[PDB]
Design a protein around this ligand. Sequence first.
Ligand SMILES: Cc1cc(-n2ccnc2)cc2nc(-c3c(NCc4ccccn4)cc[nH]c3=O)[nH]c12
Length: 295
Amino acid sequence: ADVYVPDEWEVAREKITMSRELGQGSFGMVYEGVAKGVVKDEPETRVAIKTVNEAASMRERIEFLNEASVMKEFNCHHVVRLLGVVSQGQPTLVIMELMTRGDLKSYLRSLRPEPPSLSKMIQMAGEIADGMAYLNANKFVHRDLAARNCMVAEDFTVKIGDFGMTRDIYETDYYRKGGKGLLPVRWMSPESLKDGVFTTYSDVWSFGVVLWEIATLAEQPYQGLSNEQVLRFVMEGGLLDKPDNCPDMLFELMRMCWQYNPKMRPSFLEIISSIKEEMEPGFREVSFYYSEENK
Ligand SMILES: Cc1cc(-n2ccnc2)cc2nc(-c3c(NCc4ccccn4)cc[nH]c3=O)[nH]c12
């Protein structure tokens, strides 16, 4: 077996059926399929099946497994769910909640004329903020919040995905610096760019950039600035320009998230409270915000 430390998340491979490809993932191809007994009331569930290249060592396979194991601790409607792991023998698999529409950056670019209404943009923002508020409440700091790291469900619901996970696909969204490691510099707070430290406040900064991506259909932030120019611009108080035809209140939220002083930024909870009224009816029943765990 691709033996790491198996735990209660292991699922027999005979319970998984792979139907067709979804697309290339960082460690290998991702397929859609069905898994038996991964959800309480469901005999079988439609799922996403992540695989690792046939060419891959024990270390790399264990890496793939360890990377996925962070989500074992999450249980939130607005965070993509991990459903199982096949670590015993080849091929190594990770079973996840199926999100048919792929990553949010790709979804956004697919809407290009060659877009979401303000109410639809608020809905995405609220869903993303709810997933983040849930993570921050549980002491988790994402460190790589960006549209590329959010996923879109069949019914269009947006959910938080893995830190990185979509790093080998959008390589230009990363830059090698700070201990010469790949960092998503165009999404990073000025304080993180300076000392390499990430907090819930810096996750909120990144959230502002996500709003900006949504408002521009995922253009590259700071287009026209090199990676090195970005570091200097942002560290010295520079901000992204209000997108063309961007609703005022959306840009207002961005500016709040982009306060130079991290303590001046709103919390994900505060963001949600400000748009709560605009969220579709069912938000009350599925959100972390309105849950008994939020308090
Ligand atoms: C890769 C991909 C492609 C998809 N697609 C093709 C055309 N339209 C959509 C859907 C999809 N859902 C997943 C899932 C995952 N792949 C992680 C990942 C890697 C690279 C890019 C994006 N996401 C994970 C969990 N659930 C998914 O449904 N991955 C995909």
